[PDB]
Symmetry: C2
Amino acid sequence: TIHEFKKSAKTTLIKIDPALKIKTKKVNTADQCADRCTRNKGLPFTCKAFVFDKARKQCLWFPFNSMSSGVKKEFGHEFDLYENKDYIRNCIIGKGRSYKGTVSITKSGIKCQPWSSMIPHEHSFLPSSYRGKDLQENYCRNPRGEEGGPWCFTSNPEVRYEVCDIPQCS
Amino acid sequence: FKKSAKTTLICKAFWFPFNSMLYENKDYIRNCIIGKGRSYKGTVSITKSGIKCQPWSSMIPHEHSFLPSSYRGKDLQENYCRNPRGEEGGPWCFTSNPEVRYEVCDIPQCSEV
């Protein structure tokens, strides 16, 4: 069930306010955190994201994600952020500069090449050169915010790259 | 996926490059709302309080008149959050908690950048 969440390595979330209080629990694996979050079992709120503290092998369930207002991302080696896809906008507004969904296939049904890898295609689009553009896994993205919206490097050696088909909100 | 018992149109959904807009891939069904949410057709099925939603076709624990038949086109399927009357408050659902009849669901607006 953890494959249903968008993973963001070495990241945690922080939000301050009265009302809601994060839910925590020591477990053995992150999958356990995903299971409880998906089924939303025993959670006094609707879980939009969770963090697996790989150090304390602890879990943190949040009634919010990185796009929620008043929430901040923070780097952390022991942390791993998992966001529920149902709450990450799955359509784009215009050029899709800010698209952060999990679609990872071109409009030709060709699977995408991970960004941090150079096989089969060599490129200069490494995450470290685009801090803030979320170039992870093989998710379609628009790092330079160009027309033609989100795209990715196809795994097909015959095709270097190809835009992905992501619906307009309208 | 978003199941729709006994149905079909005339890989987004199954295998066509489009869907009714039966199993439909959630990535190709807008998961955010514009305004009231009258047109919302996503799969969120838990309220703003974490309570799982009661199926629309069920009369327990809460008896109601929002029958799928009386609201054809409103997609009152399973226990998905909806807003069939396009009311202010946004998509909602009857809850599985006998003490809480209904409650809105926390679905974000599209134009929320």
